Design an enzyme around this catalytic site. Sequence first.
Site, PDB file in Angstrom:
ATOM      1  N   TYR A 142      -7.604  13.673  -2.147  1.00 17.18           N
ATOM      2  CA  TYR A 142      -7.424  12.918  -0.921  1.00 17.18           C
ATOM      3  C   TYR A 142      -6.880  13.847   0.165  1.00 17.18           C
ATOM      4  O   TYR A 142      -6.045  14.701  -0.076  1.00 17.18           O
ATOM      5  CB  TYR A 142      -6.421  11.800  -1.253  1.00 17.18           C
ATOM      6  CG  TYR A 142      -5.927  11.114  -0.033  1.00 17.18           C
ATOM      7  CD1 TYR A 142      -6.676  10.091   0.556  1.00 17.18           C
ATOM      8  CD2 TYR A 142      -4.672  11.447   0.497  1.00 17.18           C
ATOM      9  CE1 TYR A 142      -6.187   9.428   1.677  1.00 17.18           C
ATOM     10  CE2 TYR A 142      -4.194  10.791   1.623  1.00 17.18           C
ATOM     11  CZ  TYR A 142      -4.952   9.800   2.224  1.00 17.18           C
ATOM     12  OH  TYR A 142      -4.472   9.166   3.346  1.00 17.18           O
ATOM     13  N   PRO A 181      -3.446   3.473  11.142  1.00 17.43           N
ATOM     14  CA  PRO A 181      -2.497   4.583  11.011  1.00 17.43           C
ATOM     15  C   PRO A 181      -3.202   5.861  10.553  1.00 17.43           C
ATOM     16  O   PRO A 181      -4.179   5.802   9.810  1.00 17.43           O
ATOM     17  CB  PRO A 181      -1.508   4.069   9.968  1.00 17.43           C
ATOM     18  CG  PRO A 181      -1.566   2.575   9.956  1.00 17.43           C
ATOM     19  CD  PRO A 181      -2.994   2.308  10.360  1.00 17.43           C
ATOM     20  N   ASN A 210       0.826  -1.199   0.000  1.00 20.74           N
ATOM     21  CA  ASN A 210       0.000   0.000   0.000  1.00 20.74           C
ATOM     22  C   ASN A 210       0.863   1.253   0.000  1.00 20.74           C
ATOM     23  O   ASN A 210       1.808   1.398   0.763  1.00 20.74           O
ATOM     24  CB  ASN A 210      -0.883  -0.072   1.234  1.00 20.74           C
ATOM     25  CG  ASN A 210      -2.026   0.962   1.271  1.00 20.74           C
ATOM     26  OD1 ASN A 210      -2.516   1.227   2.349  1.00 20.74           O
ATOM     27  ND2 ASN A 210      -2.484   1.501   0.112  1.00 20.74           N
ATOM     28  N   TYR A 252      -6.180   3.843  -6.829  1.00 21.49           N
ATOM     29  CA  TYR A 252      -7.105   4.988  -6.909  1.00 21.49           C
ATOM     30  C   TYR A 252      -6.366   6.216  -7.403  1.00 21.49           C
ATOM     31  O   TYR A 252      -5.168   6.389  -7.209  1.00 21.49           O
ATOM     32  CB  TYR A 252      -7.708   5.360  -5.532  1.00 21.49           C
ATOM     33  CG  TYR A 252      -8.161   4.214  -4.696  1.00 21.49           C
ATOM     34  CD1 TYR A 252      -9.071   3.271  -5.175  1.00 21.49           C
ATOM     35  CD2 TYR A 252      -7.829   4.215  -3.341  1.00 21.49           C
ATOM     36  CE1 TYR A 252      -9.601   2.311  -4.316  1.00 21.49           C
ATOM     37  CE2 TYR A 252      -8.363   3.272  -2.479  1.00 21.49           C
ATOM     38  CZ  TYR A 252      -9.234   2.296  -2.979  1.00 21.49           C
ATOM     39  OH  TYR A 252      -9.750   1.347  -2.118  1.00 21.49           O
TER      40      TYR A 252
END
Length: 190
Positions: A77, A126, A44, A73
């Site tokens: 954000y 996180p 990730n 994606y």
Amino acid sequence: QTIQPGTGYNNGYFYSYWNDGHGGVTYTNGPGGQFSVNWSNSGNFVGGKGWQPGTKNKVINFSGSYNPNGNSYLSVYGWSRNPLIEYYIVENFGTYNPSTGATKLGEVTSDGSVYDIYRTQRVNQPSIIGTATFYQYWSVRRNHRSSGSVNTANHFNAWAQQGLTLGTMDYQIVAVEGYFSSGSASITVS
Ligand code: NA
């Protein structure tokens, strides 16, 4: 330049690049609001450019090429504080739709497409303030695209009408995120 995970400012824009420790990601800041990312079987990661802090009425422009090979994606954000919220306005994505891991509250027709609105709760995960439990807000664009403008107010206001409260804005970027996949992308933000 190609940099390691961290946050900072480059050519007038805030940037954040984060990953989970798995390798295979190359994130590069370019001129102005440009950045590019190439990933090969990464874990990730999230990387992109924008502003620190963001605002609740910013009209964000983006354009480029986005070629995900799996879960990924391309979104506006960002985060807010009090309450702590991680949010996405997803403009394009790969093989994984956020609708899986989330719950739907409504829809909003914005900038040429209907978006489905979801909330999910991240438990003990996180965050910009360390391990925490917080809500995640999503608008997911039905018609994927690689360029255009996002009037963020359309989404923040729609979320508010659905009972989703946003706190004081922290960073706000256009970010490419990948999750155990491969891909390439080059994006300019303004
Ligand atoms: Na966790």
